[PDB]
Design a binder for this molecule. Structure first.
Ligand code: GTP
Ligand code: ACP
Ligand code: GDP
Ligand code: LO9
Ligand code: CA
Ligand code: CA
Ligand code: CA
Ligand code: MG
Ligand code: MG
Lengths: 426, 437, 54, 310
């Protein structure tokens, strides 16, 4: 009875978090009213990992919705599955964070963090055995970025022996709201390197490139971007939600994916990515090849420019597990130079019989690759371009921060890049 | 009659134990409700099957077993399975947080919280014993609980039951059905701590079981149930001498006497034959000579290695079914003229043979075909050191970069315990080389 | 080729065939090492909470 | 696309095999410690046979037979030839040897004293696996202070004109199926002195026809194929990889002497032989054909003579 407490913070965190709950509720047979109407035993066997059970055979997501402004959370409450959330678990302010990390982390967000920890405490106190937390947020804004990392630090203080997992959306000039996004992301990465066990790096650059180049969407919207995030988040949590030969939890994922404490930033990948051919049947070799293809990576990093430390693959749908193991071993034997030799058998594959909605079969890729340094190099370059002239810093010094905190954040992220490059050449 | 207590630790130990106790009930005619119509001594008796089963006043035959796991989902299947009525809740011990594939967590952090509860439940089984021989411990090498809590338990069993014997059934890690990258770490850590507490350990490599299931049972992708059905047959033919009338390996002490001349070299190689597919309707029954010769084909061993490039210290042939002594000696006389069987100079070139006329029982509807005669060969050959060499090499690759070490130190382990454990394994590899080279 | 120790019964038969003749830590020590690892766990957690308090 | 690793840079034979494998476009050389390989061109010493055949989804082949050193070590060959029921019965083609540890000291002197008593040829050569040849047993035992004392062929076949001594080197390939292939080309290494120094079979055959009115096949090669077959079939139950988790092939170098009565004697077996310069291309291609491509096929006479056995 290992429960996961889910937390979504900010506009992006609440939008990808709400889509996550719509998607997995459908897979587990939970209607918007919280009543189960599925037809499989596998749907409910591990339902307690993400859902509480209220009276009347209702299932309530163990989710906490946080934002410094009520706008995005009103959209959730009016959204499709908005009535499935516990009403007490809506914790919101009124001022907003103004796309400012300092407001989220220091001034506006400190004012609201205590009532969020109160809701976290009530959910944790009714857990038979808490695994830890998964957080959805962006790094380019203010609430998810600044207040989200403040939550992570305070949650660790009260729950130092629980796993902290984040779905962190990286900013990109291709999909940009404000120019201060490299500042907010660099400050957040500093916090993530220290206080999370597992971060799924969801780069908006990759999501945009996939929509534009692969899915042939000339003008991608956030809904299009979040369609990929929903699909990826469903796949990476499959082995936490469904019974199988390999049952995972948040700690087993961290132990096996993270050889060194700071290198816990993962490249997600998904196949198929089909443009609306949605009826055409994909073979197991095709899923395996696309799953490792860089055009299916959600972190805008070319894996062939680095080496894989660890890889977790999950195949969903009814297929030959014999053929799945064949194709996965074939990819390793064909491209053996891209897997580090000092971690033997660093690829593990799992199979779930239940495919996601609208797919006869799929494949999700969780890789800890050294190529992820490309993502942090990109942010570090965008950061340095402005910081060398102290551009836009007054928004942050006006909230009490000083420049030294920026210098330390950039230094820590450069170290992270160097640490990934170190084991790429080990 | 002297009792044997079985202890199943972790997912691999529990799921294998469930398969073994199902097979035991089929072999002894014990129904899932615990009743045994052939047993005429109601609520007692000192028969051979009473080594593994006690009896209540109602006639229920209860296994002398205890299942322990640091999480409840695997043992819950025992509470729900066909043989749920066999056990009482005190025998099924579960925790909250499992070891998360981390030896340090199973041994230090979480095992320390539950070690007293397990010992108290084992004491309750030991008090019902008029003369306990010792314990049979089933566990994986790679699991956090199977490695971590087992080595803690084996330490405490040597304290509380110093004069008792402890035999091991260990699942050597294979990547094809593994669950963690750190199984080499956990395997070496638990071997170093358990080495001086186990009197005899039977290693089963999942790689060998997997490939035997593929090539002899025509199973495309063997699952745990496939592997455990085959493992349960091998465990049964090993423990049969404790559960039936016989004269070979009748108590746990004889396992060490007949197979372990040197205490550290206590890992006999198991070879089993024949493995016939049940889907194969037309089956030609193999002879005594054919199944005995199959005991020397590396493709039939529970650990893949080459006994030709090693030395035998001890060999035991365990026949079940229609086998007569004369047929064994004619098979051995033929095999010695053809096979490469090199014994150490300080041991006699010979075989201790045990025959039980009852043929192997197969689970109804299973993958294994019923045969007229089968054999399990237990041979302490230095060739099994190959498995240690492979495992130590995988350990050396990760440890050279200290990869994943922080998860162990983060639970209170010291980095020095790794090198201390590795040096012991280096000494063990040297002990095998000094014996057979 | 010599067959010795032939013991027979209703359940089966056993014997030996020869071909060629030849030519613990106390509970106190365990408890100290387990508590030592718990101390190192508590120390590392205390340093963490101290860092977080800063 | 198959993968292979090179773990013996000093091997001139398999440096050429590696060159040919890459020249096919369907083989890829990995780092020497990459375990995800199909073929291992391994090292001569301490080859990790225990780690072969354990990588999932890979058929692994090595260029050495585990246990073949019993044939390629001089002391081991003498003990094998003396104790094996399949060889010790005959051994009319192997010179009288004795393994002397620095033991058959008494048995050597027993046959030695008989030769001096009968005034027979009593010259013995001592060697290891530094050589001394002497007619006094005292000088032999003192020279070795493990060695073997072998009878030195006092009446060798001498090529003319030149009165020169020679040996014959034959290359034998044993594949994963334990087929025994004898390379059609051997070499004769001439001593160049009265009792580049390389004579090949075509000339040697012509000499035997001109000088002795016989053929290489009839006078020498039948005994060669008999000795090669006897040595390799003897150890087949000990080294075969038929039902093993990995497969083995190996190239051997057999060394023969011919006495003046056209009788062939075995001298040594080489587990890591080099080839003749002229024959490197042909033999290495045959190694790829019958030993490597047989297991890993790619997308016509034979340079080998298949020694038939049951
Ligand atoms: N043959 C066989 N092997 C198993 C079985 N279950 C697990 N294993 C092996 O055990 C190893 C993993 O150890 P587990 O027993 O699953 O882990 P654990 O003992 O429960 O401890 P944790 O890691 O904390 O969960 C893998 O190498 C598996 O191949 C089983 O039912 N049969
Ligand atoms: N019994 C014997 N009678 C005559 N000559 C002998 C002999 N034993 C060895 N020789 C001589 O020594 C040669 C082979 O000896 P040896 O086994 O030492 O070769 P070697 O190992 O030193 C180098 P290679 O392996 O290339 O032959 C023969 O070709 C011959 O000239
Ligand atoms: N993929 C995705 N990215 C988003 C979404 N909403 C905002 N973002 C990104 O998040 C950053 C803006 O942060 P935001 O969440 O709006 O700020 P916050 O509400 O203060 O936490 C920018 O990089 C946006 O591109 C969304 O729905 N999906
Ligand atoms: C396979 O899918 C998974 C796996 C897991 C656990 N893990 C990751 C691994 C990476 C490499 C190797 C080598 N042998 O084992 C493993 C691994 C086991 C957690 C999970 O939770 C999200 C989903
Ligand atoms: Ca305010
Ligand atoms: Ca009774
Ligand atoms: Ca003891
Ligand atoms: Mg916004
Ligand atoms: Mg477990």
């Amino acid at each position: 009875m290992r429960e996961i407490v889910h937390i979504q913070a900010g506009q992006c965190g609440n939008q990808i978090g709400a889509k996550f709950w719509e998607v997995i509720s459908d897979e587990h047979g939970i209607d918007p009213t919280g009543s189960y109407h599925g037809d499989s035993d596998l749907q409910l066997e591990r339902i307690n990992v993400y859902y509480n059970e209220a009276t009347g055979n209702k299932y309530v997501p163990r989710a906490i919705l946080v934002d410094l402004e009520p706008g995005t959370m009103d959209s959730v409450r009016s959204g499709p599955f908005g009535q499935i959330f516990r009403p007490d678990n809506f914790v919101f302010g009124q001022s907003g964070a103004g796309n400012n990390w300092a407001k989220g982390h220091y001034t506006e967000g400190a004012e609201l963090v205590d009532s969020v920890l109160d809701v976290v405490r009530k959910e944790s106190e009714s857990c038979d055995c808490l695994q830890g937390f998964q957080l959805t947020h962006s790094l380019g804004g203010g609430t998810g970025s600044g207040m989200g990392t403040l939550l992570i630090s305070k949650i660790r203080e009260e729950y130092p022996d629980r796993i902290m997992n984040t779905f962190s959306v990286m900013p990109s000039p291709k999909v940009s709201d404000t120019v201060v996004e490299p500042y907010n992301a660099t400050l957040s990465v500093h916090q993530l390197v220290e206080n999370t066990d597992e971060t799924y790096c969801i780069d908006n650059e990759a999501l945009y490139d996939i929509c534009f180049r692969t899915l042939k969407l000339t003008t991608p919207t956030y809904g299009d971007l979040n369609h990929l995030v929903s699909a990826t988040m469903s796949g990476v949590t499959t082995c936490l939600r469904f019974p199988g030969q390999l049952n995972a939890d948040l700690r087993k994922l961290a132990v096996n994916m993270v050889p060194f404490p700071r290198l816990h930033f993962f490249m997600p990948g998904f196949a198929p990515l089909t443009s609306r051919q949605q009826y055409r049947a994909l073979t197991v070799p095709e899923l395996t090849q696309q799953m490792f293809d860089s055009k299916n990576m959600m972190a805008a990093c070319d894996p062939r420019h680095g080496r894989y430390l660890t890889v977790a693959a999950i195949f969903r749908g009814r297929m030959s597990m014999k053929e799945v193991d064949e194709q996965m071993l074939n990819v390793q034997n064909k491209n053996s130079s891209y897997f580090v030799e000092w971690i033997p058998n660093n690829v593990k594959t799992a199979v779930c019989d239940i495919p996601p909605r609208g797919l006869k079969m799929s494949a999700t890729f969780i890789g800890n690759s050294t190529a992820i340094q490309e993502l942090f190099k990109r942010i570090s370059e965008q950061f340095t371009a402005m910081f060398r002239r102290k551009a836009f810093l007054h928004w942050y010094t006006g909230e009490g921060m000083d420049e030294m905190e920026f210098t330390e954040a950039e230094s820590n992220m450069n170290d992270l890049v160097s640490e990934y490059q170190q084991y790429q050449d080990a | 009659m002297r009792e044997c207590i079985s202890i199943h630790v972790g997912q691999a130990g529990v799921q294998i134990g469930n398969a073994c106790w199902e097979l035991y009930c089929l072999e002894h005619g014990i129904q899932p409700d615990g009743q045994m119509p052939s047993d005429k001594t109601i609520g007692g008796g000192d028969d051979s099957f009473n080594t593994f089963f006690s009896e209540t006043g109602a006639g229920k035959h209860v296994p002398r077993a205890v299942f322990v796991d640091l999480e409840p989902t695997v043992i819950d299947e025992v509470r729900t399975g066909t043989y749920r009525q066999l056990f009482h809740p005190e025998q099924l011990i579960t925790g909250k947080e499992d070891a998360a594939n981390n030896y340090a967590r199973g041994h230090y952090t979480i095992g320390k919280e539950i070690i007293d509860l397990v010992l108290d439940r084992i004491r309750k089984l030991a008090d019902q014993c008029t003369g306990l021989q010792g314990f049979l411990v089933f566990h994986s090498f790679g699991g956090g609980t199977g490695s971590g809590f087992t080595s803690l338990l084996m330490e405490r069993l040597s304290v509380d039951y110093g004069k008792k014997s402890k035999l091991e059934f260990s699942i050597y890690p294979a990547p094809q059905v593994s669950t963690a990258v750190v199984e080499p770490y956990n395997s070496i850590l638990t071997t170093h701590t358990t080495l001086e507490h186990s009197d005899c350990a039977f290693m089963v490599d999942n790689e060998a079981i997997y490939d035997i299931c593929r090539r002899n049972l025509d199973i495309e992708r063997p699952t745990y149930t496939n592997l455990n059905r085959l493992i349960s047959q091998i465990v049964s033919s090993i423990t049969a001498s404790l559960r039936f009338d016989g004269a070979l390996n009748v108590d746990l002490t004889e396992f060490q006497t007949n197979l372990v001349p040197y205490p550290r070299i206590h890992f006999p190689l198991a070879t089993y034959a024949p493995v016939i597919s049940a889907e194969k309707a037309y089956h030609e029954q193999l002879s005594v000579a054919e199944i005995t010769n199959a005991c020397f084909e590396p493709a039939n061993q529970m650990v893949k290695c080459d006994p030709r490039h090693g030395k035998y210290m001890a060999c035991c042939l365990l026949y079940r079914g229609d086998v007569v002594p004369k047929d064994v000696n004619a098979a051995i006389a033929t095999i010695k003229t053809k096979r490469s069987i090199q014994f150490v100079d300080w041991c006699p070139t010979g075989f201790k043979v045990g025959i039980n006329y009852q043929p192997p029982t197969v689970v109804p509807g299973g993958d294994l075909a019923k045969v007229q005669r089968a054999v399990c060969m237990l041979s302490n050959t230095t060739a099994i050191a190959e498995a240690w060499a492979r495992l130590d090499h995988k350990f050396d690759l990760m440890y050279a970069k200290r990869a994943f070490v922080h998860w162990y130190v983060g639970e209170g382990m010291e980095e020095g315990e790794f090198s201390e454990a590795r040096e012991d394994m280096a000494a063990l590899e040297k002990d095998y080389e000094e014996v057979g080279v | 080729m010599e067959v010795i120790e032939l013991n027979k019964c209703t359940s089966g038969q056993s014997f030996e065939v020869i071909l060629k003749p030849p030519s613990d830590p106390s509970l106190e020590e365990i408890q100290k090492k387990l508590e030592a690892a718990e101390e190192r766990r508590k120390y590392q957690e205390a340093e963490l909470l101290k860092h977080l308090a800063e | 696309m198959y993968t292979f690793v090179v773990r013996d840079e000093n091997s001139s034979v398999y440096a050429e095999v590696s060159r040919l494998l890459l020249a096919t476009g369907q083989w890829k050389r990995l780092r020497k410690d990459n375990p995800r390989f199909n073929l291992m061109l391994g090292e001569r010493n301490r080859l990790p046979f225990g780690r072969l055949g354990h990588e999932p989804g890979l058929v692994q082949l090595v260029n050495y037979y585990r246990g073949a050193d019993k044939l390629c070590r001089k002391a081991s060959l003498v003990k094998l030839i003396k104790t094996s029921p399949e060889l010790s019965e005959s051994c009319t083609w192997f010179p009288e040897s004795y393994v002397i540890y620095p033991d058959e000291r008494e048995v050597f002197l027993a046959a030695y004293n008989r030769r001096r008593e009968g005034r027979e040829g009593n010259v013995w050569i001592a060697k290891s696996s530094g050589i001394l040849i002497s007619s006094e047993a005292s000088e032999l035992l003192d020279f070795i202070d493990v060695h073997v004392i072998q009878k030195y062929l006092e009446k060798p076949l001498l090529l003319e004109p030149g009165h020169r001594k020679f040996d014959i080197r034959s290359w034998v390939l044993v594949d994963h199926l334990y087929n025994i292939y004898l390379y059609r080309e051997g070499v004769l290494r001439t001593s160049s002195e009265p009792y580049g120094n390389e004579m090949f079979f075509e000339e040697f055959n012509q000499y035997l026809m001109d000088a002795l009115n016989t053929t290489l096949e009839n006078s020498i090669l039948l005994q060669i194929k008999h000795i090669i077959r006897s040595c390799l079939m003897c150890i087949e139950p000990a080294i075969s990889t038929k039902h093993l988790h990995y497969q083995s092939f190996q190239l051997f170098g057999f060394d023969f002497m011919v006495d003046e009565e056209l009788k062939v004697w075995l001298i040594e077996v080489n587990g890591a032989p080099a080839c003749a310069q002229k024959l490197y291309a042909e033999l290495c291609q045959g190694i790829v054909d019958v030993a490597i491509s047989s297991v890993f096929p790619l997308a016509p006479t034979s340079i080998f003579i298949k020694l038939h056995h049951h």
